[PDB]
Every structure is written in C-alpha cells, then in structure tokens.
Amino acid sequence: DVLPPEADSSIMMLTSDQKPDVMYADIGGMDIQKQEVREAVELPLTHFELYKQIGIDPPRGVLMYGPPG
Amino acid sequence: GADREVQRILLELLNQMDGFDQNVNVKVIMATNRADTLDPALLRPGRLDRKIEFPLPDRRQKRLIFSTITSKMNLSEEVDLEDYVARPDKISGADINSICQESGMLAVRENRYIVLAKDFEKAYKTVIKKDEQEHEFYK
Amino acid sequence: LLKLFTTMELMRWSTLVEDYGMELRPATDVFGSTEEGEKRWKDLKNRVVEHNIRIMAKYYTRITMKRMAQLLDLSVDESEAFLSNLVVNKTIFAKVDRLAGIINFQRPKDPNNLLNDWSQKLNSLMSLVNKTTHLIAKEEMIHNLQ
Amino acid sequence: AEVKGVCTEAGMYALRERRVHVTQEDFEMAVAKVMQKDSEKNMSIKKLWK
Amino acid sequence: EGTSADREIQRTLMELLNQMLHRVKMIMATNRPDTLDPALLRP
Amino acid sequence: MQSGIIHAAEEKDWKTAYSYFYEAFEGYDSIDSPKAITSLKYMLLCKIMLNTPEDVQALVSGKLALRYAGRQTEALKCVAQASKNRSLADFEKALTDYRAELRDDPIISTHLAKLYDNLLEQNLIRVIEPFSRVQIEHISSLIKLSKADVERKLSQMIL
Amino acid sequence: LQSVGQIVGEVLKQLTEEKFIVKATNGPRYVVGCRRQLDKSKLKPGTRV
C-alpha cells in the first residue's frame, strides 16, 4: 500500500497544540500591516473567487521588515 | 566554503519560490530586522511583492497600544496616558509592554493592585533608559 | 447537622430552625442573629434551599411551583427567582412552565438516548438471566445429587 | 517581474473597493507602491559628486 | 560584511534571539552592554 | 473627526474611531473652535460602545474635557450609567430627558439606537433562558417595557 | 531470563490511529502498531519509542 505523500516529511506543520494564542484584536493599531498581510495570505485562501473574478494572481509572498519590537 | 553553502541555501530558496515548477497556494511570509542586506533577487515582485514595513509606533499607534495593554488591568483614576503618548520618544511596542509590565510589578511590590501615576512615571523612566555621559564635544 | 447535610433527603428549614437554632444560644459563626457581617444566617438559609433544590432535581420530574414553594419555605415568586438564578448559573437544569407552574427536570429526551436506554435494559436483562441460569444450573446440579 | 507586480497591485487596489474596475489612478498608485526606491536623503553624501 | 566566522556568530545570535516560552526564565551575564544587539536587548 | 466617524460607522473598529475622535478633539480644543463638544460626545459614545462605560466618567473628568462640561456630557453620563445598570427603563428615560443632545444628532442617535436594540436582545435572552413557556406579560414586567414593543421585538428575533 | 530488550526508535508521523510511522535509529523506518496500555496523545512526532 502507498503511504500518503510526504509521510516521513521530517518537517512538521502546526498541530492543535501549537496554535499561537493571539487574535487580530490583540494587536494595537497596525491596520495597514494587518490589511496587507491579510490580503497576501488570508483573503486569497478564504475568498479566492473574489480574486479570480477580477483576474489576479494572489500576491503570494510577503516580507515584513522593521526595527526590533 | 561556508558562505557559498549559505549562498546555495539562498539560491534554492529563490528557485523554489519562483522557478521552473511554479507553485500554487504556497503563500510565504518572512520577517527580518534589516531589509537592506537582503538579496536583490529575493525582493522581486513575484516572490516578495509586498515588502511591508513595521515602523516604530507613532503618537496614534502609541495611544492604541497603551489602550490595548492597559486593558485587562486595574488602573488609577489619576493616570494621564496622554502625557506618555505625546512625549516624543522612540518607544516601540515591546518597550511599551515593558513599561506596563514593570509598572505592574512595582505596584505589586508596593502592595497595591491599582497602579498610580508615580508607578508609571517610574516605569517610563526605567524603560526610556535615556543614555547619558555622551562625550559632550560631539554636540 | 452534618449528618443531615450529608444525607440525601430534604430537610425543611422551619424544622431545622426549630431544632438546631441553639447555635449562639457555643460556637463562633453562623450566628442565629447578630452583627451584620456575621448574620450569615441568610447564607445558611440559601444553602438549605440549594440542597433542597438538588434533592428535588435528583428525585423528581414534574414538581408544581405551589408544591415546590411550600416545600422550600419560600414564596412562589421567591422560589421562582432562586430557581432562575440557579439555572442561569448553570448549577441546576430545570425548565419552568410558568403558564401552569409545571417546573420540569426532565432533560429533552433524544430518541437515540431513549432507544439506547431500552437496549441497555435489554442487555442487562440478558446478562442477568444468563448468570442466573448458570447459578441455578450449579444449584440443581449439586442438590439433586442428594 | 516589476511590471507583473504593477498589474497585481492595480488589481489589489481595485479589489480594495470591492470593485471589478481598473483605472489610471489605480495603475499609477500601483506603480508608485511597487517601485518604492529607498534613496539617500542627507544630500551631502549625494552632492559630494558635482 | 564580516568574515565567515563573524556571520556564523551572527547566525547563532539570531537563532538564540528567535528561540528566545513558558516558565523558562532567563539570566544573562556580561561585562559589556555595548556589543549587545539592540534586538537582543529588547525588553 | 471624519475618519473617526467613518471608522465607527463602517468597520466597528471603535478603538481606532475613538483615537481619531480624540485627535480631532485635541485639534479643535487647541484652536478654541466651537466644534469640540461634538468630538467629545463622539469620544464618549465610542467609550460606551466599547462595552466599558466605567471609563466615560474618568474621561469626562479629564484635564482638557472640563471647559465644555454641561448637558452634553451629562446626557452621556446618564446613558453610561443606564447601560452599566442594564436598566432599559432608565436608558429610555435618559434618552427622552436629553432628547436635545442624544437625539436629533444622527451620528450618535443611530449608534445609541443600535446599542439599545442589542441590550434589549441580550436582556430578553437572559430573562427568557430560565423558562420553557412564559407569558409575554410576565416577560414585559421583568424587563420594564411595554407588551406591544416586547412582542414586536420577540417576533423580529424569532423571524 | 524472561525479559528481552526492545528497539529504540522515533515516531515520524501519527498515521491512522493505530498506525505510526516510526524510524528505527540507525536503520529503516516501519509502520507499527501501538499496544493497549499507552497514551496515543502522549505519542507525538520526535518522541522516543
């Protein structure tokens, strides 16, 4: 029997245990950054039809840079 | 040798992010404290098409952060967070959290669950940590 | 007193006060009547009421509000308020038909649960009869040897 | 790649207003956003070379 | 643009910085705060 | 002030809405312009809508928000106390008493009406949970409203 | 006399509730079953076995 692909990956995703306990609301302001990241990695995965109907490749990939803290 | 191995790691990352075998639904997020040193090829719209900046909090963001942190926290009626917010400094979110946290511990040691303006003023000084003794001829 | 509060039976507050009011007539708290901060007498009354609620919820399915009040030694409206507070706190489950005062502790009966209970009764019956036939086989299979 | 990013960002701006449009305003703003050149502003290091 | 060893040391710092979550308190000891990375000194 | 209004109306980001309203209030106070009491009212409204009425009195007793004291802040104080006590009757009493301030001003009247409806919904749920069959008269007596209004609200909720 | 040593390995993936992909260190990787008295929840990738 063939096992599921990438079994023995050696790289583990986030199980229910890790699941960082942080909200979108437990972050002061940062409306611009939240919107940009959400459009990058949340809206395409939640409502993809919205992007497709406009005819766009969702902006996969995003860099976050700034002074520490 | 070792720096070439690091360069090969970088090249493999570039090639996997955007190469011959195009990916789908593999959105990638990466964070760094210094965006200038990064390779110019791993900054190319198609691999990193956002380049979001996270500047130090402005006055308004300072106010929002202070509200969000001072929530879930008993607070004295005589406190004026407006003064701390307006006082122009370079305080970041982490050090704002530290201000609130050490004000809390100062109050605990002072045997009190409701922090006063003296307690904050102490915390604000101890977080600003204004460096001094700068050899004065530079000015 | 401790025996009554550990036994599974309703104890009327009127009888308990005509029995064990000696407290402060002895000990240092729950005063029969005293300074305000130590007239916890009302807290003890509430504890008696709560114990009665627990016993009734354990040993009833449909208790009329009139009977519940006259058994708990509180007005109908007072008992209604106490039961509503308990329900909101989630300590007790009880659905109150105030149109006819038909307080009911019967949780909604899923057909799955009803048939599962029936099947469990059947399984227990079959196991019991099997064990009884084994024991009776031994019984007759020894005595008839005599 | 920068041109493709320009198109993507113009589409993103259109999406921002739950729209299906694209216009010169959105395209120009997308160009400005995508080609964010980090220059030098002391003006002395800049004017060293006449 | 330090040397290869310097960049390796910076990478080791960077790993420590990121890994540095529950009931694991930490004490540092040093004779110099000048060299310390601003991020590593972050509150 | 306009940005605060938009944030309050659209995305329910009342924290940012209050931030912008406070910025507008500081600007108008510095100018000494009459259009600062409106910003103060909107800041208090944001504080109430944040489900933290306790801070409204603290903000009113502020360093800058004293020259404008009067009926304008008294109305918000009354609304805050009514919300904190969850008294729908007292809420409506304050609304009718300060109709001049709380009502006739759309940007605040609409939000206060929505808050009233939400509080009525929550109170109805709380008072109806400990039951399985109730008299609308009994519920109305418990909640301190009128039979017709409670009936219409219940019908809307059920629908 | 009546004891025998086991084989030390490390889980690699919690497959179907009974199947665990375990890599025997310095050896191959099997799919194995879990005996009765054990905490499947306790068993997580990287745990020794």
Tokens of F5: 């209004």
How were these coordinates obtained?
cryo-EM
Q: Which chains pack against A, by 3+ Cβ pairs within 8 A?
A: B, D, E, F, G
For F2, residues 6+ apart whose C-beta sits below 8 A from its C-beta are none
Paired with B53 in beta bridges are A65
Phi, psi for residue F54 in degrees, rounded to 5: -60, -30
Distances (CA, A) of F47 to B63, F58, F67: 14, 11, 20
Instruction: Please state whether beta strands G19-24 and G29-33 pair in parallel, antiparallel, or not at all (unpaired).
Output: antiparallel
Whether the Cβ atoms of residue F25 and residue F40 lie closer than 8 Å to each other: yes
In single-letter form, the type of residue at position B33 comes to: N
Closest by CA position to D5, among listed D23, D32, D25, D24: D32
Phi, psi for residue F62 in degrees, rounded to 5: -95, 180
Chains E and B make contact, 3+ CB pairs within 8 Å = yes
For A59, residues 6+ apart whose C-beta sits below 8 A from its C-beta are A39, A40, A44, B49, B50, D8, D9, D12
Binding site of A, by residue number, is 66-69
Nearest CA in chain C to F136: C99
For E26, residues 6+ apart whose C-beta sits below 8 A from its C-beta are E20
Q: Which chains pack against C, by 3+ Cβ pairs within 8 A?
A: F
Of B36, B46, B51, the CB nearest to D1: B46
For C24, residues 6+ apart whose C-beta sits below 8 A from its C-beta are C30, C31, C32, C33, C34
Whether the Cβ atoms of residue C80 and residue C63 lie closer than 8 Å to each other: no
If 0-12 CB within 10 Å is exposed, 13-18 middle and 19+ buried, where does residue F140 land? Answer: middle
Measured CA angle at C87 (ends C85, C93), to 5 deg: 150
Paired with A64 in beta bridges are B31, B52
Binding site of A for ATP, by residue number, is 66-69
Owner of token pair 């700034």: A66
DSSP string, E1-43: ---HHHHHHHHHHHHHHHH---S-------S-SSSS-TTTT--
Distances (CA, A) of C61 to C55, C75, C96, C106, C112: 12, 21, 12, 5, 20
E38 Cα to chain B: minimum distance (Å)? 10
Whether residue E36 lies within 8 A of chain B, CB to CB, comes out as no
Closest by CA position to F55, among listed F68, F46, F66: F46
Tokens of E38: 């601003």
- Residue G24 belongs to what H/E stretch? strand G19-24
Cα(F1)–Cα(F97) distance, rounded to whole angstroms? Answer: 27
Tokens of F37: 């009491």
How far is C-alpha A55 from the chain's CA centre?
A: 21
Cα(C130)–Cα(C133) distance, rounded to whole angstroms? Answer: 5
Output B13-20 pairs: Cβ under 8 A, ≥24 positions apart.
B13/B42, B14/B39, B14/B41, B14/B42, B14/B47, B17/A61, B17/B42, B17/B47, B18/B44, B18/B46, B18/B47
Q: Where are the beta strands (DSSP E) in chain A?
A: 62-65
Cα(F112)–Cα(F53) distance, rounded to whole angstroms? Answer: 13
Closest by CA position to A27, among listed F74, F15, C52: F15
If 0-12 CB within 10 Å is exposed, 13-18 middle and 19+ buried, where does residue B62 land? Answer: buried
Query: Are residues E7 and B3, on separate chains, in Cβ contact within 8 Å?
Result: yes
Whether residue E25 lies within 8 A of chain B, CB to CB, comes out as no
Question: CA quadruple E4, E6, E12, E17: dihedral positive or negative?
Answer: negative
If 0-12 CB within 10 Å is exposed, 13-18 middle and 19+ buried, where does residue F90 land? Answer: middle
Phi, psi for residue F24 in degrees, rounded to 5: -60, -40
Quote the crossing angle between the two packed helices F2-10 and F14-31, to the nearest 10°: 160
Query: Are residues C98 and F133, on separate chains, in Cβ contact within 8 Å?
Result: yes
Phi, psi for residue F157 in degrees, rounded to 5: -60, -45
Cα(B98)–Cα(B92) distance, rounded to whole angstroms? Answer: 10
> Which SS3 state, helix, strand or coil, does residue F117 take?
helix
Residue ranges of alpha helices (H) inside F86-105 are 88-97
